[PDB]
């Protein structure tokens, strides 16, 4: 937990939180709702529609 509400910092490069494990899990911007719920996929395509 990079920031367990204590004032640690966890600065790795340029004083910036150290990508923890709990960060990926519940991002967002990661798994949970991006790698487990709504996954891109293949064998698909899209384009403009016409009548």
């Amino acid at each position: 937990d990079n920031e367990i509400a204590g004032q640690p910092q966890a600065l790795q490069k340029s004083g910036r939180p150290l990508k923890s494990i709990r960060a990926r899990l519940k991002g967002k911007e990661g798994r949970l709702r991006g790698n487990l719920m709504g996954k891109r996929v293949d064998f698909s395509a899209r384009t403009v529609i016409t009548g």
């Binding site: 798994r31 790698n35 996954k39 891109r40 996929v41 293949d42 064998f43 698909s44 395509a45 899209r46 384009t47 403009v48």
Partner: protein, 49 residues
Amino acid sequence: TGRKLVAQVFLGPTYYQRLKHLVDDKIHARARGPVQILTRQPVEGRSRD
């Protein structure tokens, strides 16, 4: 045919604007394409593809 049209047409010049974002730039098709390294799922738009 050459038949007159029953109805009368509102024909009259105007200028239309050629908008950007054409089609040949917006078509997309996937099928066993590259994938991320960390998650191992399919990449995002663009690339190839």
